[PDB]
Design a protein around this nucleic acid. Structure first.
Ligand SMILES: *C(=O)[C@H](CCSC)NC=O
Ligand SMILES: [Mg+2]
Ligand SMILES: [Mg+2]
Ligand SMILES: [Mg+2]
Ligand SMILES: [Mg+2]
Ligand SMILES: [Mg+2]
Ligand SMILES: [Mg+2]
Ligand SMILES: [Mg+2]
Ligand SMILES: [Mg+2]
Ligand SMILES: [Mg+2]
Ligand SMILES: [Mg+2]
Ligand SMILES: [Mg+2]
Ligand SMILES: [Mg+2]
Ligand SMILES: [Mg+2]
Ligand SMILES: [Mg+2]
Ligand SMILES: [Mg+2]
Ligand SMILES: [Mg+2]
Lengths: 75, 177, 66, 50, 77, 116, 136
RNA sequence: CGCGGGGUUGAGCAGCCUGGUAGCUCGUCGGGCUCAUAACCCGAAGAUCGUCGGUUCAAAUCCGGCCCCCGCAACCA
RNA sequence: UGCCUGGCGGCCGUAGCGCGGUGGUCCCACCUGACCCCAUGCCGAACUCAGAAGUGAAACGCCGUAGCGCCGAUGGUAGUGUGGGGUCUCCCCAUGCGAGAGUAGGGAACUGCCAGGCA
RNA sequence: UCCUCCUAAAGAGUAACGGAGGAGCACGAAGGUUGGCUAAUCCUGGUCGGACAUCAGGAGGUUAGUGCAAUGGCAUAAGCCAGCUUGACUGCGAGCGUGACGGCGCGAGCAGGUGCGAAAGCAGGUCAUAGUGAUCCGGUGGUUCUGAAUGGAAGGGCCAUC
RNA sequence: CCGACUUACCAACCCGAUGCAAACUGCGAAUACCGGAGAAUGUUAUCACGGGAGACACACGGCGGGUGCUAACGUCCGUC
């Protein structure tokens, strides 16, 4: 898509860098916390009496919905 | 066709006398020639098939039909529809012309010639042969081509048996042993 | 035929190295003069001269000048 | 899923559209089909446009 | 053990009118999957290969044909 | 083969002309003669026949087996049938291509009042 | 142990062992063991009753086994409640009907063959009998 | 025979991430430096990307089966 | 009326395959030639056209032949409806229906509508 | 939730945490029509070529093939090519089949306009059976059908559709 | 070099004989089911519409089966 920023060229470069790297860091952080909150869900979602315990946090792993990244046209 | 006239004027009477035939149409007669070559290497380069087609179009005055693979096989990694071979069918006048211009000039030109094998019939009167060098034909002048790609000649005849086919081809002074 | 999808086809006059002039309709565009035809091919004369390679026992007796 | 819905609008000027699916990635080409137009009751061309 | 236990609702195939039954026009005679019964005289063949009467009469099964294939016809009386 | 190959080419157009129950005109063509007959919808008994084997059709001909021979027998079939009351038939290629003397045979019968 | 290799289907229905038998005639050899009772006869009782009769004739003479198990039988493990699938196939049996010819041998005297089959008939659950070869 | 993670050079690991280039560190070998061994400098060798098939023009990579290794589970009165 | 031939059906192996023999006056088949009417993803091989020299070799048709295919009783056997019984995870009796495989055997067809040549 | 086979006891139907497999699609041609063609696997011959690529002859005969799992079917081909094409069309529909219903399916024929074919004719999607969710609330286009005094309009209604 | 010899071995496809199959069929019943005709017999026993319900926990026995161990007064179907 076409995204609009103010500036001349250097403001555009700085905004693009500090937005794209911000996105590529935030998405990594969210994916890491998904892989961590998945711990008990894939650890013990079964057996014994605990059973129901891990269902509490099975919904906060899909109330995140990792934002997809798009490969840059620049290559 | 000089060879056609030679056939109908000498070979018919010779073969009836030699074989004790009842009908003039019982005599074995050559009905078609087939020139083919399956290039094989056309998997990674299609232009080589076109070069082969040009070679056969030069060798025989026709346009080769490009034949594709009948079924897929993983031995040579081919699929169905892949163009693999080229083939030319000759009947009648052009067939006689190719027969003459093979057996009178092209056969001597092959390097280290001794004589075509006589045990190379398919038990039903037909004949087959490989040339191993496309440059023995005068239509190819050793400068246009890039390979030593060979041809298969297949003489399909009306002959009932391989013995009758041998006799018919020897009537044309075929270079046997 | 199929209306100019094939190469040209015109009569030519080719000759051997001893003459033996023949008319063969081919696709060359110019006649050629070549080696011996089937008539003059030495596959029925030099057969003995073809299978003749060998000989050293006699090549030593000529050396033996004593 | 991959096959996306489109619609074939009529070229007779009337508002009457057939609807169909089309594989959106083979090449983007407006479909050109002659179809019946019940408003004018005659066959016309239906250039696709959503 | 498990991963099984799946089926599909029955399709109610088979012959609906047998030989000698007086059928009206357009009444289904047989509901096949392939073409086990071939359409003979005065019967049709739907896109299900479903043979139906075209003219009201009496059904008649026969085995005519070079390959001994069952044909359904109608004696329109 | 050659005859069993053609006799297979005609079994679809023929087996539909039997379901429709329509009187059909069937042609058999030979490199020396061309035949034509009008066959009842039963397919077993024939109302009208006319072919170059007949003397009345062939003795007026330079050579039976060319296009104008087919026209001369195409005229004969129609004029033979129009008195019998048979007017509405359906053409039967019988395996041959509708291009040559079969075409000329058909048009000559078509031009003589036969409807098909 | 006899067992089919590359069976089409893993498990088979139970089925009922009715009717008489088919392989009722000794055709290969001259002396044979004919079943008189009925009941499935496993692939271990086939081997354990063959070991006993290819050794009662020392080692000389041929022996034909005219039965093959080719029937999978499943069993439910211990302390497993009913349901939740079908059991796990354990062994293979050859259903025997009265009239079957199970084993047979040739190249031995009648008295030795008749005694050898008396050593295999004591390893098989079903009642058996001794039959010779006729000319039908 | 139930569930997840891996198999790439001698060892430990990238390259899977949208298929178009087999890489890193230690190690090995052959020289040089030294009285000599280390350290150091120079150059080179190897791997079917676990094995088998499938779309693919093309596969370490996409898909499916097989084998092996690493953890876990197989409940309560 | 007979013989042979061509087309269209009925009938679908007792009807097909094999092996041996046989038919060209008509018919059919090959066959000659191909600029042209048309054609081959090359080739008049196939489709098509102009023809009639030659052959009945191939094909086709007919006759003969059991080596295969195929049809197949009678009797018995299995099964089973209803009603009884048993030592009743399988059978028996009364009664009705009655296979499959196999055996003796049959078998290398029959027929109709037009159109030809010959008698 | 849906599709195919068996259990299902030779009409239809018939259960279990019974035994085995699949779907949430694909196609502007992979549909219509006209013309044509016939497979797998083996033997003998043939340059590289090989156990199997391509060519010629023979035996076999559908053991090949069907966009996709299985069953039924397919030579008149429903399988394989090529020419032209949009019937993958609008309003209807005698009469049936299957469901407790909501519904789902087959359908000759009639009217208007087409495509292929010389013509008889065929064509209302694909060899058939899976490829799917009602209502409410809304969005888009068309239509004076209604329009809260009257003329408009907003909003409803009907058709197409998300 | 070609394999120039051999092996007490393994041996796919074909030929003769012998068995097995719910998801095999070049064969194939008894019954059951659908339709037509004919007498007898059955206080309409058949169908359609309208008022009122109850019931949707079934059990055993015989015959055909799945599961189980052709175990259970076990469990799930078909018909009486
Ligand atoms: C379990 O059976 C025991 C209760 C016994 S009371 C008669 N324990 C419960 O927690
Ligand atoms: Mg019999
Ligand atoms: Mg049933
Ligand atoms: Mg039943
Ligand atoms: Mg019920
Ligand atoms: Mg299709
Ligand atoms: Mg067609
Ligand atoms: Mg089609
Ligand atoms: Mg389909
Ligand atoms: Mg108002
Ligand atoms: Mg107001
Ligand atoms: Mg509105
Ligand atoms: Mg309830
Ligand atoms: Mg209940
Ligand atoms: Mg119950
Ligand atoms: Mg009883
Ligand atoms: Mg109970």
């Amino acid at each position: 898509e076409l995204r609009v920023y103010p500036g001349n060229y250097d403001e555009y470069m700085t905004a693009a860098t500090q937005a794209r790297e911000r996105l590529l860091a935030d998405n990594a952080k969210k994916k890491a916390q998904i892989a961590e909150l998945q711990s008990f869900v894939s650890r013990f979602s079964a057996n014994a009496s605990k059973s129901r315990q891990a269902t509490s946090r099975a919904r906060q792993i899909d109330k995140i919905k990792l934002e997809e990244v798009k490969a840059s046209s620049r290559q | 066709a000089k060879l056609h006239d030679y056939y109908k004027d000498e070979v018919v009477k010779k073969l009836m006398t030699e074989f004790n035939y009842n009908s003039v149409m019982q005599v074995p007669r050559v009905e078609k020639i087939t020139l083919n070559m399956g290039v094989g290497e056309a998997i990674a380069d299609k232009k080589l098939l076109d070069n082969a087609a040009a070679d056969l179009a030069a060798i025989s005055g026709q346009k080769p039909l490009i034949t594709k693979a009948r079924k897929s096989v993983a031995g040579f990694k081919i699929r169905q529809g892949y163009p693999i071979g080229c083939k030319v069918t000759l009947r009648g006048e052009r067939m006689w012309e190719f027969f003459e211009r093979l057996i009178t000039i092209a056969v001597p030109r092959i390097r280290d010639f001794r004589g075509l094998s006589a045990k190379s019939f398919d038990g039903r009167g037909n004949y087959s042969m490989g040339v191993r060098e496309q440059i023995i034909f005068p239509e190819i002048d050793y400068d246009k081509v890039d390979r030593v790609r060979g041809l298969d000649i297949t003489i399909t005849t009306t002959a009932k048996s391989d013995e009758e086919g041998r006799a018919l081809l020897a009537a044309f002074d075929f270079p046997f042993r | 035929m199929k209306k100019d999808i094939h190469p040209k086809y015109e009569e030519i006059t080719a000759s051997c190295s001893c003459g033996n002039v023949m008319k063969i309709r081919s696709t060359v565009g110019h006649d050629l003069n070549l080696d011996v035809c089937s008539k003059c091919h030495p596959f029925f004369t030099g057969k003995q001269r073809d299978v003749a390679t060998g000989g050293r026992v006699d090549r030593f007796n000529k050396r033996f000048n004593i | 899923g991959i096959r996306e819905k489109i619609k074939l609008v009529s070229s007779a000027g009337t508002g009457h559209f057939y609807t169909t699916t089309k594989n959106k990635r083979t090449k983007p080409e407006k479909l050109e089909l002659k179809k019946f137009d019940p408003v004018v009751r005659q066959h016309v061309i239906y250039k696709e446009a959503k | 053990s498990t991963r099984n236990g799946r089926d599909s609702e029955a399709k109610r195939l088979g012959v609906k009118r047998f030989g000698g039954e007086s059928v009206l026009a357009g009444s289904i005679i047989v509901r096949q999957r392939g073409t086990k019964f071939h359409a003979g005289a005065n019967v049709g063949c739907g896109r299900d290969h479903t043979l139906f009467a075209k003219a009201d009469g009496k059904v008649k099964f026969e085995v005519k044909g070079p390959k001994n294939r069952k044909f359904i016809s109608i004696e329109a009386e | 083969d050659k005859k069993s190959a053609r006799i297979r080419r005609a079994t679809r157009a023929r087996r539909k002309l039997q379901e429709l129950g329509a009187t059909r005109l069937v042609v058999h063509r030979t490199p020396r003669h061309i035949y034509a007959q009008v066959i009842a919808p039963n397919g077993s008994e024939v109302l009208v026949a006319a072919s170059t084997v007949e003397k009345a059709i062939a003795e007026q001909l330079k050579y039976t087996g060319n296009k104008d021979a087919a026209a001369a027998v195409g005229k004969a079939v129609a004029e033979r049938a129009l008195e019998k009351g048979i007017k509405d038939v359906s053409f039967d290629r019988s395996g041959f291509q509708y291009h040559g003397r079969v075409q000329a045979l058909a048009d000559a019968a078509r031009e003589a009042g036969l409807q098909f | 142990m006899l067992q089919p290799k590359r069976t089409k289907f893993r498990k088979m229905h139970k089925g009922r062992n009715r009717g008489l038998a088919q392989g009722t005639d000794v055709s290969f050899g001259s002396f044979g063991l004919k079943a008189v009772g009925r009941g499935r006869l496993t692939a271990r009782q086939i081997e354990a009753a063959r070991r006993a009769m290819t050794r009662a004739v020392k080692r000389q003479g041929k022996i034909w086994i005219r039965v093959f198990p080719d029937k999978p039988i499943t069993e439910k493990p211990l302390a497993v409640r009913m349901g939740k699938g079908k059991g796990n196939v354990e062994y293979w049996v050859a259903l025997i009907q009265p009239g079957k010819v199970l084993y047979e041998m040739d190249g031995v005297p009648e008295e030795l063959a008749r005694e050898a089959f008396k050593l295999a008939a004591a390893k098989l659950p079903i009642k058996t009998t001794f039959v010779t070869k006729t000319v039908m």
